[PDB]
Amino acid sequence: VVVYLYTVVAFNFFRKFYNKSEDGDTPDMKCDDMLTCYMFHMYVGVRA
Amino acid sequence: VHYVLEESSGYMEPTLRILAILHTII
Numbered sequence: 069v070v071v072y073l074y075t076v077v078a079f080n081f082f083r084k085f086y087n088k089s090e091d092g093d094t095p096d097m098k099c100d101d102m103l104t105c106y107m108f109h110m111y112v113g114v115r116a
Numbered sequence: 117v118h119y120v121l122e123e124s125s126g127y128m129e130p131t132l133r134i135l136a137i138l139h140t141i142i
Binding site: 103 | 123
């Protein structure tokens, strides 16, 4: 629940940061989707 | 710049509004 709260906050206020592009100019795995951003959080930010 | 609920075969966009209405009522 707390990670979902952080996810909605980031989706609403931080768009230009989740830019995990490889080799440059490949913007993907961003926060352009609520479920994608929630999975990214719960999978990377917890274990980081 | 525009938040959109484009993820299903309908029945998810109006249900959110009716659920918010029911939540405020309750």
